[PDB]
Amino acid sequence: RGMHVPEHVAMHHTHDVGPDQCCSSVVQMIHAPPESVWALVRRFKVVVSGLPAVSSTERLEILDEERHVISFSVVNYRSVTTLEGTVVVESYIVDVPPGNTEEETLSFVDTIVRCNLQSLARSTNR
Amino acid sequence: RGMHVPEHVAMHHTHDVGPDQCCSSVVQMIHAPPESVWALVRRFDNPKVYKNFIRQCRIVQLHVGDLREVMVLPAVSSTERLEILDEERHVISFSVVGGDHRLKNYRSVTTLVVVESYIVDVPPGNTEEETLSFVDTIVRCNLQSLARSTNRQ
């Protein structure tokens, strides 16, 4: 967006759009210290079942302990995650393969992140 | 929370866990008044108010006995009722009669002590350590989504 401190969020959360490629931002912050949050955002659970099958092909491309950055990816995703307490932004990338529209998908890959960075705040109250 | 909590968590939750009919609770706590909590949640018209992964939803000619047409990827679509809309003792329950989807019998009791009880005809022709975990997580996200939208935190 142009956050409070988009500084390590810069090169990362900056993703290239495309003709089929997409991406978006988030608002979820925590008041427990940041390194106490990183703690949990470092140990690779949050398929979720539902549909008959469930596949993924994930991979780590960035790991930064000193400044706090872990970039997920697929084998298209390219999730990036950043940080009196702490902030936690979010962004990713994706595909609209014939079958839907961005206002279902990026709102199908949107709604989950809140339910993933919301899971993180409970575990570090405030 | 605690043990003086049956006030309306008796005549509801004390409920028929039959043979293939499972259920489970939900630890959640919000710093707004239960009245402030209730308004956000009361809204059965739009479940979107706070409930996740939903899509557009209508009704039938909100009320007690008036059906709705919520819908959620590939395919699946949910059709519910509102057996109980108790507005004084914060309680909503609603069954998914006339649904399109797999997961069978339902009566999602959301009472406020803030707890959501779910029931699922134990079999979707599948496991049981998954039927609970598939939904109980779905449940999880929503009440967590309930919390956010009111200034609990």
Author numbering:
A (entry chain C): 37 to 80, 84 to 85, 111 to 139, 147 to 154, 160 to 202
B (entry chain A): 37 to 97, 101 to 111, 115 to 154, 163 to 203
Publication excerpt:
A 13-member family of ABA receptors PYR/PYL/RCAR (PYLs) in Arabidopsis thaliana was genetically and biochemically identified. Upon binding (+)-ABA, dimeric PYLs underwent a pronounced conformational rearrangement, and then bound and inhibited the group A protein phosphatases type 2Cs (PP2C), including ABI1, ABI2, HAB1 and PP2CA. PYLs/PP2C heterodimer blocked substrates binding to PP2Cs, and thus released downstream transcription factors SnRK2 kinases formerly inhibited by PP2C. Structural analysis along with biochemical data in vitro demonstrated that steric hindrance and hydrophobic interaction in the pocket of PYLs were crucial for their stereospecificity to ABA enantiomers.
PYL5 and PYL9 represent two extremes of recognizing (−)-ABA. PYL5 bound (−)-ABA most strongly, so we first tried to acquire the complex crystal of PYL5 with (−)-ABA. However, the X-ray diffraction data showed that it was highly twinned and could not be merged together. In addition, X-ray diffraction images from apo-PYL5 crystal also showed a highly twin. Nevertheless, the apo-PYL5 structure was solved at a resolution of 2.68 Å. On the contrary, the corresponding two residues in PYL5 and PYL3 were smaller, and thus allowed (−)-ABA to dock into the binding cavity. In addition, the dramatic contrast of binding (−)-ABA between PYL5 and PYL9 also denied the “flip” hypothesis, which supported the hypothesis of dual selectivity of ABA receptor.
